[PDB]
A paper describes a structure:
No culturable Bacteroidete has yet conclusively been shown to deconstruct cellulose via the actions of a PUL7, but we recently identified and characterized a chitin utilization locus (ChiUL) from the aerobic soil bacterium Flavobacterium johnsoniae. The F. johnsoniae ChiUL consists of 11 genes: two SusC/D-like pairs for oligosaccharide capture and transport, an inner membrane transporter, a two-component sensor/regulator pair, and four enzymes. Here we present the crystal structures of the FjChiB chitinase and the FjGH20 chitobiase, as well as a small-angle X-ray scattering (SAXS) envelope of the novel FjChiA_M domain.
The remaining GH18 chitinase of the locus, FjChiB (endo-acting), was active on chitin and CHOs, but to a much lesser extent compared to FjChiA. To investigate these features, we pursued structural determination by X-ray crystallography and were able to solve the structure of FjChiB to 1.63 Å resolution. The asymmetric unit contained one protein molecule without contacts indicative of oligomerization. The overall FjChiB structure is similar to other structurally determined GH18 chitinases, having a (β/α)8 TIM-barrel fold and containing a CID between strand 7 and helix 7 of the (β/α)8-barrel (residues 249–286). The catalytic motif (DxxDxDxE) common amongst GH18 family members, which supports a substrate-assisted catalytic mechanism, is conserved in FjChiB (Asp146-Val147-Asp148-Leu149-Glu150). Electron density consistent with a formate molecule, likely from the crystallization solution, was found in the active site positioned by hydrogen bonds with the hydroxyl moiety of Tyr205 and the carboxyl moiety of Glu150. The orientation and position of the formate molecule is similar to that of the acetyl group of a GlcNAc unit bound in the -1 subsite in several GH18 ligand complex structures. Relative to SmChiB, a processive exo-acting enzyme that is amongst the best studied GH18 enzymes, the binding cleft of FjChiB has two distinct differences, described in more detail below, which leads to the cleft being more open and exposed to the bulk solvent. There is significant diversity amongst GH18 chitinase members in the CID region, both in length and sequence, and the CID in FjChiB, while similar in overall structure, is shorter than the one found in SmChiB, leading to a much more open cleft at the + 1 and + 2 sites. Previous work has shown FjChiB to be an endo-acting chitinase and the openness of the active site cleft is consistent with this activity.
Residue numbers in the entry: 36 to 344
The structure:
Amino acid sequence: SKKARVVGYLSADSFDKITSIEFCKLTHLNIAFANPDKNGNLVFDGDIDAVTKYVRSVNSNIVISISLAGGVISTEQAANWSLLIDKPENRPAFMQNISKFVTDHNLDGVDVDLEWDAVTSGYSGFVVELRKELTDRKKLLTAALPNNTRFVNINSEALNAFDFINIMAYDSTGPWSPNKIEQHSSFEFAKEGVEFWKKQNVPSEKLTLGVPFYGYNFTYPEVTSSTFGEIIQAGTQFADQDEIGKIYYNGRPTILKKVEYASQNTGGIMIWELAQDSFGEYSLLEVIHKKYTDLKYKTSGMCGNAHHH
């Protein structure tokens, strides 16, 4: 059947924007991010129960996961990760803590967003053990992975354990490469990422194509980020292009292209990050929703979608 996922990341710092986010257009919501403290306990700064209560009242079928780690972790958090998963004898208590967090907060799964250097030697054993805990409790286990790099510390059993993966098909350049002044999330980069993970023997259905609701401003040597919402505030005439001088993002036509491509080549679309959108008429989440509906794909089945599915 014509169906697709629409997986949205929501940062803790975005919680006061949830009344503007159309959760009826998502199938999955990832709350970002929880991280371990010095004691092996998962810390989340924010009223996650209030958020999930509200979200489930908007879309009672949404699948809500806690996302772990994330792109921005402190040296202390990264060291706690390494201490907890790189020594197999430290994993047991941490794993129980993760499972109890999922139960205590009535969540549907866990998303692993350990990135780059935080993908340490214990990653695969951690994933395999956590996978069993969650499978046995009928919960999801997913991961966000880089566009076109296979980390040595992600073995095949771990990679295949995930219910699906979220390809981070963006950040091809950024503030860490301030002289590569160009698009950070081109259509070609997205296609490269999908093809790459298929070459890793991940089936199409288990791929989710990430798209960015932000861009980078290379005007000065210090590169800054701009949300799509901020770009539209600068002018609605910018909604349908990808570049303003040295600012590079994804406008509506390019998001639309990526949705058309995803419909034929992956199991869905992933969004970083929901509260960066332009809420209302120019919304990129709306572009995704409308395009999947026009293609006759079921996503949420709400708010106009999947009428004749």
